[PDB]
Amino acid sequence: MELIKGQALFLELDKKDFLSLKNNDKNIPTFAHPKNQEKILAIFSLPYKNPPQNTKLIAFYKDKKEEIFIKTLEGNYKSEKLQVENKKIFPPKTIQERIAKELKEANAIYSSYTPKALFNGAFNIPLNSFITSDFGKARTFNEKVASYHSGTDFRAATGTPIYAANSGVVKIAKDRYFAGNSVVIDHGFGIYSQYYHLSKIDVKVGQKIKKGELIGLSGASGRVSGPHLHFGILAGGKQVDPLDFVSKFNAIFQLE
Ligand SMILES: [Zn+2]
């Protein structure tokens, strides 16, 4: 198989006698195929930055081993040269401490795997507008990716109602330094949706939110060029192309 860097892929395997799916020594979790009871699924994601050129997964069964080969593709992402080197920025210590604490909190949240579905059918787009900044727009330094857009931006004047893309449990609902006012929803199976730069948060941590319920109002909080909604998906441990992910997920789980 082939997969563009920064995208997720739903791998299908036989359920019977399956033991484990591994990438080197890393275990990849599995979940049931919703329609074919003889099948299970796993989400494999390639990091946008510095991906391997190829990946070989091993599915271990009771009586056989299967190999899955995935070639990394570069895709057709927008890219331009970094005007100034991404040097060490030098924030005040109080800001450095906040950034580090919020990184630690986020890592803990994305490492807390929910082994059941919290979603309800297909994902919906969180608002009815249009993309203003595509996922995966990159800035390069000596033809090495220095930074990239890790979600997708939608046009939104400040105060635009934002709705949960799918049902789940709220894991972040607060102001963070870079993301601004942030909502992150766990959908199960290591799938998280992200809503950043909000002007108002209308949910609390731990809340079971239903698809299409209001989560807040769009804004321009945090690090932003102006008002908009930033929408992201983390799945298979990595930020992935969110609309591409929604299409692939919906092809499997839409109800039906
Ligand atoms: Zn963005």
Author numbering: 20 to 275
Quote from the publication.
In order to gain mechanistic insight into how Pgp3 works, we have determined the X-ray structures of the WT Pgp3 in two crystal forms (bound separately to tartrate and to citrate). For the tartrate-bound WT, a model accounting for all the amino acids of the recombinant Pgp3 (Glu21-Asn273) was refined at a resolution of 1.86 Å to Rwork and Rfree values of 17.2% and 19.9%, respectively. Crystals of Pgp3 could only be produced in the presence of either tartrate or citrate molecules. Both molecules bound to the active site of Pgp3 via several hydrogen bonds and salt-bridge interactions between the carboxyl groups of tartrate or citrate and the Zn2+ ion. Furthermore, in the tartrate-bound complex, the side chain of His216 (NE2 atom) formed a hydrogen bond with the O3 of the tartrate molecule (3.4 Å), and the side chain of His247 (NE2 atom) formed another hydrogen bond with tartrate O3 atom (2.7 Å). The O3 atom of tartrate in WT Pgp3 (open form), which is the position of Wat-1 in H247A variant, is seen interacting with His216 and His247. Specifically, in the tartrate-bound complex, Wat-1 and Wat-2 were displaced by tartrate O3 and O41 atoms, and in the citrate-bound WT Pgp3, they were displaced by citrate O5 and O6 atoms, respectively. When the structure of Pgp3 in complex with tartrate was overlaid with that of the citrate complex, their overall structures were similar with RMSD of 2.95 Å over 256 equivalent Cα positions. However, both structures showed a large deviation (RMSD 6.98 Å) in two regions (residues Glu99-Phe109 and Thr159-Val164) near the active-site.
We have described herein the reactions and the structure of Pgp3, a Csd protein of C. jejuni. This enzyme turns over the cell-wall peptidoglycan by both the d,d-endopeptidase and d,d-carboxypeptidase activities, as documented by mass spectrometric characterization of the requisite reactions with synthetic cell-wall fragments. The Pgp3 monomer is structurally divided into four regions: the N-terminal domain (NTD, residues 21–95), a flexible linker (residues 96–147), the LytM domain (residues 148–259), and the C-terminal helix (residues 260–273). The Pgp3 LytM domain contains a highly conserved tetrahedral Zn2+-ion-binding motif (H168xxxD172 and HxH249).
